[PDB]
Hints:
The structure is cut from a larger assembly and holds 1 copy of chain A, 3 copies of chain B, 2 copies of chain E and 1 copy of chain G.
Chain B: H1 7-15, E1 22-29, E2 32-37, E3 45-49, E4 54-60, E5 65-69, E6 81-88, E7 90-93, E8 101-102, E9 119-122, H2 145-150, E10 160-163, H3 169-179, H4 181-185, E11 193-200, H5 204-216, E12 223-228, H6 234-252, E13 257-263, H7 265-278, H8 292-300, E14 314-322, H9 331-339, E15 342-346, H10 348-352, E16 365-366, H11 375-394, H12 406-421, H13 432-443, H14 452-468, H15 471-480, H16 485-500
Parallel strand pairs in B: 8-12, 10-14, 10-15, 11-12, 11-13, 13-14
Antiparallel strand pairs in B: 1-2, 1-6, 2-5, 3-4, 3-6, 4-5, 7-9, 15-16
Helix pairs in contact in B: 6-7, 8-9, 11-12, 11-13, 12-13, 12-14, 13-15
Chain E: E1 3-10, E2 13-18, E3 28-31, E4 39-47, E5 50-55, E6 67-70, E7 76-79, E8 87-88, E9 105-108, E10 125-126, H1 131-136, E11 139-140, E12 147-149, H2 155-168, E13 174-179, H3 183-195, E14 208-213, H4 219-238, E15 243-249, H5 252-262, H6 278-286, E16 296-304, H7 313-318, E17 324-327, H8 330-334, E18 347-348, H9 358-384, H10 391-407, H11 427-439, H12 456-469
Parallel strand pairs in E: 8-14, 12-16, 12-17, 13-14, 13-15, 15-16
Antiparallel strand pairs in E: 1-2, 1-6, 2-5, 3-4, 3-6, 4-5, 7-9, 10-11, 17-18
Helix pairs in contact in E: 4-5, 9-10, 9-11
Chain G: H1 4-7, H2 11-33
One magnesium ion binds at residues 169-170, 263 of chain B.
Amino acid sequence: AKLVRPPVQVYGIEGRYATALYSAASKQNKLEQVEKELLRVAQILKEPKVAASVLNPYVKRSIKVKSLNDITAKERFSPLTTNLINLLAENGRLSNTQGVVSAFSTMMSVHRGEVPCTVTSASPLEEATLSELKTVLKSFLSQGQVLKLEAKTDPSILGGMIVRIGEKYVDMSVKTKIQKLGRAMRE
Amino acid sequence: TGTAEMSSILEERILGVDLEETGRVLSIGDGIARVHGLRNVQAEEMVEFSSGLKGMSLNLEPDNVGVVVFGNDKLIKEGDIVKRTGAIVDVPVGEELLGRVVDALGNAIDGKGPIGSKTRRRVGLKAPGIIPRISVREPMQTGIKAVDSLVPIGRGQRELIIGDRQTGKTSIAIDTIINQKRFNDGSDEKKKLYCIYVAIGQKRSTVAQLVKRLTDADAMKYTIVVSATASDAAPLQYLAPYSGCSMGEYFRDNGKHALIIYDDLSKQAVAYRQMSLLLRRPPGREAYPGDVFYLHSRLLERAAKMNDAFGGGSLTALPVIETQAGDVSAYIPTNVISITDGQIFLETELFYKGIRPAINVGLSVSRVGSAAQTRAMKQVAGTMKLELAQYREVAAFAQFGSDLDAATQQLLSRGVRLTELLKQGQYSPMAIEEQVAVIYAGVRGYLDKLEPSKITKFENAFLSHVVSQHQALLGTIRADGKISEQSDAKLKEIVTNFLAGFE
Amino acid sequence: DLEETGRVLSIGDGIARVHGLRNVQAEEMVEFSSGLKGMSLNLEPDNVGVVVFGNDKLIKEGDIVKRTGAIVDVPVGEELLGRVVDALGNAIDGKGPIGSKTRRR
Amino acid sequence: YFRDNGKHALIIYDDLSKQAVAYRQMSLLLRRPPGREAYPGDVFYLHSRLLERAAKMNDAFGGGSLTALPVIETQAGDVSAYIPTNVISITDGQIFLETELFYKGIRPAINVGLSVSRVGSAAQTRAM
Amino acid sequence: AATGRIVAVIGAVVDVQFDEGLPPILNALEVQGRETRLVLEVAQHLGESTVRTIAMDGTEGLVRGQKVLDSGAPIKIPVGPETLGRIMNVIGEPIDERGPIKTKQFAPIHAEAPEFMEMSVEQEILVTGIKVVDLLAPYAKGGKIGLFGGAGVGKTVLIMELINNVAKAHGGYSVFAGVGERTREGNDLYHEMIESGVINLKDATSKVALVYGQMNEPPGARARVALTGLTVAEYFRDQEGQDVLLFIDNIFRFTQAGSEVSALLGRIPSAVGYQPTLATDMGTMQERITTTKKGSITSVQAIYVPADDLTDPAPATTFAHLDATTVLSRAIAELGIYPAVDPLDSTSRIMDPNIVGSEHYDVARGVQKILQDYKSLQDIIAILGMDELSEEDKLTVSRARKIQRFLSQPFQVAEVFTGHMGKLVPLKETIKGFQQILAGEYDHLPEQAFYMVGPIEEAVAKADKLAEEH
Amino acid sequence: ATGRIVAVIGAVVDVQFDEGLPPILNALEVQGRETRLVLEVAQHLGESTVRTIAMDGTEGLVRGQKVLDSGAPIKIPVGPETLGRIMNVIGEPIDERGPIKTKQFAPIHAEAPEFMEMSVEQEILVTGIKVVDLLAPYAKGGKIGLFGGAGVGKTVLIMELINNVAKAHGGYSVFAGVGERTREGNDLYHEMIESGVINLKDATSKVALVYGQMNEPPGARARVALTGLTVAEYFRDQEGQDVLLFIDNIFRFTQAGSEVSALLGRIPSAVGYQPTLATDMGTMQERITTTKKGSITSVQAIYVPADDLTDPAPATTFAHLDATTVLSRAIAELGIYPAVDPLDSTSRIMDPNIVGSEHYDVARGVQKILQDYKSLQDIISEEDKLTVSRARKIQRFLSQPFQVAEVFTGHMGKLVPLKETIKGFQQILAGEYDHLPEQAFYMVGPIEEAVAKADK
Amino acid sequence: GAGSIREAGGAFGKREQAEEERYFRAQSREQLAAL
Lengths: 187, 503, 105, 128, 470, 456, 35
Ligand SMILES: Nc1ncnc2c1ncn2[C@@H]1O[C@H](COP(=O)(O)OP(=O)(O)OP(=O)(O)O)[C@@H](O)[C@H]1O
Ligand SMILES: Nc1ncnc2c1ncn2[C@@H]1O[C@H](COP(=O)(O)OP(=O)(O)O)[C@@H](O)[C@H]1O
Ligand SMILES: [Mg+2]
Ligand SMILES: [Mg+2]
């Protein structure tokens, strides 16, 4: 049968299971319910008691499958996520669970239209200038896009700002300009 | 990571078909199909693809089945449906196959209609044990003087025809097949030999020429030809020797005697190596799998002589092996030399020195030996073998032998005479009594005064002579199996008078 | 307690893959539940490869591996003179144990 | 550039064995599976797509040319090695040099028995 | 049709993912967005709706996500009379700059081999005019020949001589396939054929079709160009009944091309670095080059022998696919003898006294026997010297050297190399000459009179002129 | 413990258990089969899965088929009831004479005897054969390489060693046909029946046969030597005997181990042999030794690949060999039987500190005079004709009639004690019989029989 | 292995070729003057 490919691509065991879940949920158009349910099961398994019990190789696989069935039925989970956790526990990829979640999450991050944005600067920028920066960077995107901005600070660029919007990249740091002047004087 | 972890299977499991008797192709490449499901399939079981192609389940893995395809890859795509047949591979057997040319699965490829056989036999049955067998005791006549005298083969033996390319191996096999016409026509039912020629990895033109040659000699009415040619799938070239072996075991199990020629086992080993390397089985020396010796040994141990409580039948095997520059220490030559009961070794230097068949008697050996001969051939061939061994000892002194003592010169002369006596023409096998007469003339000394270049001529003329005017002594030697003293005197008189009147 | 003890994940090819032993040192002697000993060869993010000084027949998947806290060492001294020992310093001549006060890596 | 402008050029690759070694390093570090002597499967393509670019052009394309003199170092005189046989099958002839001929006083140590020019007298002056 | 996307590019291997309609194996795919035509041949179905493909051209400039279109069939080339006098490449495009090849029919380059009932058992000698070939290993009409030789022994010169002789003595639409060989040689052959009237640029009555994939091509093109030429010849044989000649130089490259992608197709190496599927690939390609009852295909294949091995898996696997193997020896080429055919290593399936006659067979066998005896006597010469042999041994050595010289023959296509003029010696002239040298009728003539001549009359004339001058 | 097949690849079977994983080297029984299929554990793969090598064919195996854990390694019946019978690698009878009704079963995997169980000084094993006992004696608990194959009377020498060790020492024999040709196995069985070594009617059988056929998977061929060694170990450790163990062939044991290791995916070592070649050979051969109860002396047929004695398989086998018996056709075609080559057969206990000074000096004199005779024959003086005469008489006196041939030849068989051999060759070397003719020594036992044949 | 001395191209194959060429060039000069 034809499979529905997510807007972004993730690979590996986690990427494969996440693509499977995304296809199986977009068919029943239940993406947000399974999103919140995957966050719920991630918070559940991350708890140290379960993270120690069901991540144990010297206890039988069927016992941990039964305990996962218990913990997914008791918390009122959809059949999709239920047999997804059952499949993860059957193949033995429970350790990849969080990974799957992560993969799924970033898929939805681009299904909502959230593009990462890094704004490196030599100093913490000004808030009104930051708002103007967000406003003008809105113009680098199509419709249904939202900047997820993380203006980390690196004081080694000596000034300016280095902006990365998804994979687009402008290098307005003054250090780049000085290195270009150096290469121009030496060559 | 994982063959059955494809996004389609996982998405179908997340969504929530028979995976017992039915499966789906996860991948297909180079003749190997990784199939999902088929949880009830057996090892080495035949399966059916949706396009009609057949396959064999060789790798049973936890999440997929490795199926080798009996055809072309293009007719199989991802997601095709595979069905079980519930049975291990088996071929049709019986006398209905005599005179037919079939493929590795017993399907007629000569257009003469469907094989009307009633019995089927599994291709992978085990050989007879220790007790069902008896010692190899009766001659399998090839009609070739060098073989029948110095490298004798018995019914139930496994004699390897080994040599470089274009040395005369197929010619020895075909002469042996043609020879059995005198026994299959006659009334003595314990001398009848039914032949099977398995052709692995040859041209279709070569097999057509061979079938024409066997039809012209009227040797096809008792011959089965199994051909898995060079354009056939590696599974078919792998399976053809076992199909032929089952066809011959049908005769071995019913008190009859069969001979089988695997031409050749090198190409079957190559096909099996390809199938194994593509299934990702751990390669060994020359990339061959670990169980290629097991392959050829369980194939060749099925040729056996049965005891009288099991019908008394037999199956003789003549595997063929092509060496590269005479290298018998290569992997597959080593295995097959280790498995068999001796080897007829052919050379290129002997071939171009005028010695045809180019049988190297120093390197050839039969471990059954004189137990596979008649008393007359014993009488003459013991002396001939001793004399040729002495000649081989002193042969390096030739081209100087005129300056050596009388003993060395006599060894050299007798050796050259006997060597000229073992030459033979293609597609003309001799009866055992005519071979006995010729070897008698050679070893008793009635050729020493003759010139070497004349020996052949003598051996021809004499033969015609003894066939016309001395059929009584030939019949006596053939019916008694030995040269009686009266027969010895009659032979002596015939040969001395012919040589007295010979030019 | 997966800091001083581990469980055998796999055994074969003379190597035992062990789960646990989070505080084991590289080249440290470990003691298997069957009485055999081993050396921690590969410290990995999720297992320890252990070279087994003995037969893999005596070690099963799921066996307990304790750690001795000592890098592989043998008993040394004057007390070994006249004795026949194996590669680990255990006397194989039946004359009783070795009364050594010193060990050496 | 010269070949395509009616001019004539000569190129020496000294040597192609070390280029094969560097390509093998790149391929093995790119995790491409090794072949004979660990060389990548397409080392012949590596050298043939290079040595086919030496050519003589006709008049419609300028009449320029590019001659190529690749160099190959053999180990102990083993002409039968992988890369030597590749490059020998590619080129239009070989100039075989020998250590025995070198030390016997024959300098340059060209082995006229083995050294062949597939073009031959077609590319000589009439006097020569 | 189906549209997929390029997801991986490693060398000449391209993985393409399809959403709907996975294409079968062996189909041709067109890469969209390229100025020149790039065809990808499907090799494997990897699962995950992805196929792996081999590129017929270079993969530089390919992008992940580039669109690919399914043709719905294997590589289809134009077939018919209109291919004669043209040069086409692996995918059927004209590369002689003379416009489109307008044929009424296209044929897929992947087809099944003829069945067993379609074989023909007729064997008839094809006289070539070359003494050693005609005598010791004659060719057959409609048989597969094969020319084995290392680098620089004379495979190309011999195949051009055979082209000249046979394909001008022929009227049946010859075909030449250049597989992984030099481009200079292809240009040379093209202009030789244009000059000798075999190819007709105007007044289109040519009688040879040309297919060329040379050394600069990626492994896929060099692996499929032999099949393209085979397909042209197959059309000429089946769709017209004509008797066809097929000259493949060099067929080893075919095998070699496969090896160059094997590891990239995910296959564990076999022996000597070859693909595991060497024998079955060679078999599926070679079993289509055959004479059926529908028509005849006389195939002459040049086979490169790496490092003069002949036990290498590629020549050793090719040996069983031929009917008359001619083996070129470097040791004979070093003796100055040309063609460098090895008399004690070349074999024909029609060297049978019930096919060629008892006189021809006896002369050939006597030549081979005297040459083997010469080989044996050379050791005694090495230890003792030539002045210690029985007079009959000296006679054997003298006649063997004379037979060696007389086996050499000057070629028409070698006049630039040799300087001598070409000779085309009939069959009975060859048999008579060698019969007389074997009988001893020229023990008085010097051995250097038989070297590089035609029939035995030229040998006597050369001996006379030598005696006059020397 | 019950598990189920999770993978079948050729002769390798992965079996998954749900409780009680079986240790390595345990035998598992596949359920629901017409014939007994036994798997042997090789590795623990993790996730309660073990990998196993099959002892028989794996065709018809289904993923999920039940497999029972036997609880021990392959156990074979051990006792005097195995004498004269044939069993395969897993101990079941393959001669169709009924079950082997022993009282005890022994596992084929056992550790070699400990350090304090070894014998500290080497003794000689007297075989009653003159050339062997004199020139290349066998040591108790040693290994002997038997060179030479067909046409040199290998089977006659094997059966005579069986008969002579049964008579002189009271110790039984085991014959392990590793990689045995079924035709030659039937032949050997019937030559042993005709020569009385095997008796199908009473309990006077001297040898027990264990056949691992050439058409069996490499695991069976790799464990049949251990099966035979287990039978011999019973006869040594429970009855204090000096057992003989024949291994034909030992190269096939190495070859089967190499094939098994290749099937398990292990990286081949040099020349393609298993990486565990030396340790496999060692774990097999170290069980062949003299303990305080009895001993096991092993005669092992050596095949040399490509005539290369530095090949890893012979080079590893030769590290364990204590003696060598070379059967030559140049000696058989000369008329001497047994066809032992007296100048190529060697021994490690041919040492004055082991066999004494007298034995060593007699053997060295015999070997020196035989080498001298070879040298003199090369050039064909004063006393060199006397050396030729004495050496020809020594060659004749190396011959011996065997008991296992009495039915075919009529000549009575001779079991010459060691002292009589030593003194006979000593006397021939001194010159005490320089008047007796040449053929008075051919095919006799002690030297008294030579003088009694010279009288006639 | 017939003709393997000359085939190995050693110091013995070169002298064999030299001997053959010397002898047969002498014989060719002897046979040409008598023609
Ligand atoms: N006894 C003979 N006398 C004369 N010619 C012979 C004889 N035996 C074989 N030949 C010829 O030698 C040639 C090669 O023999 P043949 O093909 O049968 O052997 P082969 O080893 O199977 O060849 P290939 O390498 O193709 O498999 C044939 O042309 C055959 O006719
Ligand atoms: N028949 C011949 N006569 C004279 N010289 C020849 C002949 N054949 C080959 N040669 C010489 O050997 C060289 C190699 O030619 P070629 O046919 O390309 O060999 P190959 O194709 O096998 O590598 C030629 O350039 C020529 O110098
Ligand atoms: Mg053949
Ligand atoms: Mg060429």
